[PDB]
Amino acid sequence: MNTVPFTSAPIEVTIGIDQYSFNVKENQPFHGIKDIPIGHVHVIHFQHADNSSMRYGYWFDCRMGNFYIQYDPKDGLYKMMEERDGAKFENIVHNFKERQMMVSYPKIDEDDTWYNLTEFVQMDKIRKIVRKDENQFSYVDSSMTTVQENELSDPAHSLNYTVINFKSREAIRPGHEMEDFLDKSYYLNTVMLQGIFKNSSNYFGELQFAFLNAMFFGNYGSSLQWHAMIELICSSATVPKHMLDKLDEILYYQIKTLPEQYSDILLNERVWNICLYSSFQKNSLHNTEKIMENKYPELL
């Protein structure tokens, strides 16, 4: 069970750790988050009480180093940093624990929600989508644009999601225009799975990461990416049976976790109606169709 200590909390802020969140008051003696489950990526995220604009946060994996948070009064944000001195870090954590100035990652034993949302998400893949190679953790915020959004302006601060475009030479074989447009199986299976992602696990990892960035930061480009990766599978007549069954579980937990009040901005009506009711895979997403119909029947 790992710990992310906080130097201090000088400004009032809502702190998120994965799907949980805590209000911290200005100068409250808060010194971090303990009992973080090993084996998963995690995201620690912030919304300042005085500017509910710019949700921002850090993807990390405690197996890769000792990370802490420290407020920077110049840049005006909570920053993640790595402590390279193991003994200094262990000594900081032990002191804060002894003084019980740390919140406990509040995982219910029965609850597989975080595993289910992050099943295919790997830190090494996050670090290729979010490029800052001198850090082992990855900064994301509400405003960061995707490589695809930038094509249609600071490259160093971009989300490098795989570009998916249904009306591109990449998506459409010369002489198979109608076939490839109406059945995207060659784009999914040859170009994306065999070509770029190498396997379904990496494809699902990027899909899951795009969703979580959409949900936790309201990142619009991430939402676009999540919907495009769903639509590419649903619009393919030929998908491996294991991928469809796994997609149904992935989407079920995403729809289950989504705040009820954010369905309006985070869910694309056209994509969901097409995927559940018109697409080749309209009958392959039983769990997802049941939770969507019971939770968001307005959208459909």
Place this chain on the structure above:
Amino acid sequence: GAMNSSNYAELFNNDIKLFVDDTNVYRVTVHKTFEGNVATKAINGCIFTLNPKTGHLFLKIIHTSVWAGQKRLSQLAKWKTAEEVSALVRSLPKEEQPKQIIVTRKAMLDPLEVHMLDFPNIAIRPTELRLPFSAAMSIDKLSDVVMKATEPQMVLFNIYDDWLDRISSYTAFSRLTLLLRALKTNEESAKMILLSDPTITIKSYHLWPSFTDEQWITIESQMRDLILTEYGRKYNV
């Protein structure tokens, strides 16, 4: 974006553009079977591809053999249209390729866009205009070459005959749209107006009769009257 009333003069500027109408590509007669079910029988069709500035018409005849053993023909018809328009553009010298293609029906946008991916600088546009190009098969010489075709064939016409020797493209397009609107609203009446005086003939190399400037004014008046009558009847106004 969309071609409308507001940006109408753009049709007659010096940027090459084509209208594409797919209405007459997939044509059927509906009939009863022996068992009393209904079936279709396809007849020859055509793509109507028109340069509105020059009058050059690229009439690609669609032979019934292209539908043989295909499913969802009204869907395929849009893709076949886009395939043949793309083939026509690739067949033209670079300096003759259009800078814009305007489709008369919005369902042609995705099929044409996907077939023209090799031409990212050619803009594919819809129109808010309700153009009467469906009535092209009421022009006897165009109907005749489509129905007689025994294989896929491209036939080149000038749909303005020699009008551009005397009038502007704007005026020639207005005359064409009025003739086709009349033919679409009441074909028998329109054809009667065009042939009523046997002394005015159609040249072998023309589609329409050889009217003097004064005769065209009378003809154009008769077509407007035909259109308004029919409108009052349609709506009881």
